[PDB]
Symmetry: D3
Subunit: 237 residues, 6 copies
């Protein structure tokens, strides 16, 4: 067991899907995994392992923000043999042409956190995904009839930011979505020699809120999870 | 309801105790409060309201790190009428003279997060507690036979820090405990015009690499919660 | 003697009150201290030692700004045995509800200086007063019929700042008064293992720019000095 | 004509290959393009346009460093209709497992320049390539029997850096090659709404000095150009 | 009057010499100026106006550090019509061939203060003297048989710096003398459209740990003042 | 030979004039020098050596931007015995009273590059010229009856800056001309213990869209070159 995960080596697959909400991890296990078993419940941060089309897979919540996900991702890599992390999230769009319910893949992640400056001598660390994982997700999405948008996410520390003008800067530089974790996960992956990817669905536009239904949100979430799971199978071959 | 709290105004007391772990919130509700009811379960971030010696009080987890706790404390203050937040946590000591099981009260909180720089035009914002709350906690502790130490916390973004050299700097400048939230909660309290306090129990010694046992963490935790609750009653009178 | 103080060990009390203006130190000595003698005159930075109700007390100017007061407070602490510094100053208010002639006690001090970033590896050091000293001043003020406000000061490097918009930021985050020294003194106290407090009276408003009469200014100044002196006597018990 | 390019709209293809050295641009034009003509010679920064397998292609030097290449890439995009920039260069390796003469594709580029901080409100902009261009290069390389490494470059401002320790930090975080331009080109592409890619061949290891023969260097350079040109043809499909 | 200078427009000459110590201003007035009038004594910061070789000249202390001298210099320029400021100070040397008693003229001044970053949008402002004033000082020194060194000063915020390694950096980049004010004065001069110069004499060597004797201090100080005064007369022609 | 200069010790004079454009270096060699020989052609960065009134002088292009010129100036100093660098460039004015064709001499150079912060522990290094070289240029200009102003340049990393507002800040602080190299050359000179000067002629006004068209030069540029060359002869006296 590690400080935040009451499990032992072997309990996790070598790839872990991670939504922010642990209750979505439970939903993924129930909906997509065969022979699913709960393998963590410390702090309510539910984690599960089962199989998808014969492939051992785990899913576990990461909590909100770079500091939370950095803990779990580090422990998974250093103590549970995890080689790949796929964050499966929501993001808010700053570009009108990026549509509600689009799938975005963060090949890079911008941020207003200091964590990568702390790592990288106050220089600019380009927080990036693993290329093969990116391509596997693009290809899995294409096989499901989806053209994933590949580019930069922006990982914010403040959900309630006092700097609304920054969203205009994000738009100018082509940021595809705003979320709260990718850059931190990518920094951990680089620090500890593993591989990561963040996939998000566009849940809103930052500038002007758009309504969605629970059913629409569920189906779009499910599409993202299928992309993520199928991408793993492509990566295995 | 707010984006992370499915409750109505009036469901929370005007003071909320907040451990990081929502399971500890449930423990507090069951152990210390009368007639407790669950008022939030969104994302498993359990919150409860009941009474302590006749006084309405709430308790809810805040999750790990500045970004997580900043969400919850903002929503509580702006939309649930919450006037006081008392974080009840654990910390790591760096000073030789600060011992396992000591109770530390953060009158200030240092940080390596960028959030307060973002707020404060890249100058130094001294993230501070409410003074009356500090003195109420000191006095409640004294009535329970505990001499709480009052000073600076350090709120880290990385539990697993690559800049190990910073612990000796914290030690040099008298930091009493290392945790992950206080500076963020204090920044929200200043931004949105409320009052906050962080109380921690020392659960490990970073300098000498000592760790508290299970028995040990629990009994000290109970004392911290009694301090917090009794401090509210002092503040009311 | 030290580079800026031509005195010997024992010439200073273990607590030193420090206004910015050495002529105010002379006034304090003449008005409040018995058997006062001048103990420093280097650079015209007058310092005195005498007794208040039998208790040995010193008073000495600190000059204008963080670099000036950092020199004097360091030398006093390291080489003259000084345990406590109480800055006794004026400040400018940014909050309309903070009134002219109010007493402000700086439990924290924000700043636009780089000195604490230099000390603290470019992270955020919360420059704080000693809690017991704060409580002693609050209690002394209460016994003198004054309700002191306890919160953050802002210690500016530029009395003539080119950034007017920063006052709006200070107001937003609840800064009680603007002065030029507290954060520097608090940094020295932390660096060199001593205790400090800044008490200020509100001399002006950047909002409701009203001034005062000489008589009003003297009476208010003297009330502040009485609070500071009485606070020492509480700390001694 | 623009301030650094004496040419008119149409003189350049919509994709421009850019080595640092203008003499390399001449070599590329002479060796790989049919009906090549010189279209720029301002500042000796030779640029050419011809065809490759019937497809109009341009090639032009970008000079050394972010400021130099930022000028040329901006002018090409805004004034000459250029849609894609492919930098073709050399890099120094900091990882021992990255081998001499390996092909590196910079999906991201770290930097110690301030240019992207100036663009991005002092936050972290992840300077990234266009994903489709990256995949096209990977595929073109595979068709030529070369397995390209895809990951981060580091774009240095100082070829002669006084901070030797930084190469160790680059190695820790997995940087594949050190060069001087990619992060700047990627910043311009984001700013002005175009697409870019940097392909480098490993010319040496920064810490250990290794030798190559003329035939080896010629083979590897030619291989890089073939990858670049063939990647364009894939993108066109 | 201003709060810091109790004088009227006309009371100062258009050129003011400024040592840090107001008692040295008094010495200068008594020793070098004919019929000098005391024009300020607020905060003990003595200032005088008299005549030197037919020329009206003022001299006034500036106190210790950038914030102090920034107040006085701004007020002199914007409230008293002052056109030229000549700081006359002592400095510490780091270079092996800079010797005790050497005269150093600060054509530039490096600093660890934030004041010029605040002014200059967080970019690097080169804090420089007025060229003609520098040349006038070199020429005056030569006529007095003194060979002055012209180069960079370093203006420190902390006389007692916790970062001893910075002296190595100063030495590496050729800093001639370490003092506490020049960069601040030069920033004010640029902000408010006036001209300034800092002349220092080397009173201590930071590496050899030697200092000038009392007799040497007086002689070198007198020579510096003669250079300053004679430089004004050259400027007038 | 060095990595960017294929020549041997002795091939360069101990003084090198450097325009950014190597074709201007050729022009200078063929117009102003006797018995000029091309001594470098790597990357087309033409360098020449000949004599001016019997004095051995070299001239070589430095390319655009701080990173480019930093390479060449370092190599010249450390491997070719070069003692003095005179950059001879163009610049843009922000001050209305600075006119087209004015010759500007950069006693200092401000910058938005990070290179001097990297050198100088993130403090403010005042990037300055050698005083004697500045005075030699001033004196040569006077003897030639050519007007010249001495003050600060601003060395930009982005010719195409997204921050137009910074030009108003430059104007406020008295910047004489905007170019792209001086601060980098001055940093190298300090790092490697040599001497440098930048002279520029105002080619355009950033305020009054006028600048210099086809005509202006040749004669204005020629004026700057004559000043530079004659300044060397004065420095030899």
């Amino acid at each position: 067991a590690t400080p935040h995960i009451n499990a032992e080596m072997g309990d996790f697959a070598d790839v872990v899907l991670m939504p922010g909400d642990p209750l979505r991890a439970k939903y993924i296990a129930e909906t997509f995994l065969e022979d699913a078993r709960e393998v963590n419940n410390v702090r309510g941060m539910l984690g599960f392992t089962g199989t998808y089309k014969g492939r051992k897979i785990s899913v576990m919540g990461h909590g909100m923000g770079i500091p939370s996900c950095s803990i779990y991702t580090k422990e998974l890599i250093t103590d549970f043999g995890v080689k790949k992390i796929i964050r499966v999230g929501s993001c808010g769009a700053v570009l009108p042409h990026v549509k509600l319910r689009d799938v975005v893949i963060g090949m890079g992640a911008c941020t207003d956190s200091k964590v990568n400056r702390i790592r990288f001598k106050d220089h600019d660390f380009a927080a990036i995904a693993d290329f093969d994982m990116v391509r596997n997700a693009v290809d899995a999405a294409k096989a499901l009839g989806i053209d994933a948008r590949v580019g930069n996410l922006f990982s914010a520390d403040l959900f309630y930011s006092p700097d609304g003008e920054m969203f205009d800067v994000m738009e100018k530089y082509g940021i595809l979505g705003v979320e709260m974790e990718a850059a931190g996960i990518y920094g951990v992956a680089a620090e500890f020699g593993a591989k990561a990817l963040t996939i998000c669905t566009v849940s809103d536009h930052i500038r002007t809120h758009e309504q969605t239904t629970a059913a629409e949100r569920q189906t779009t979430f499910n599409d993202m999870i299928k992309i993520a799971l199928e991408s793993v199978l492509l990566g295995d071959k």
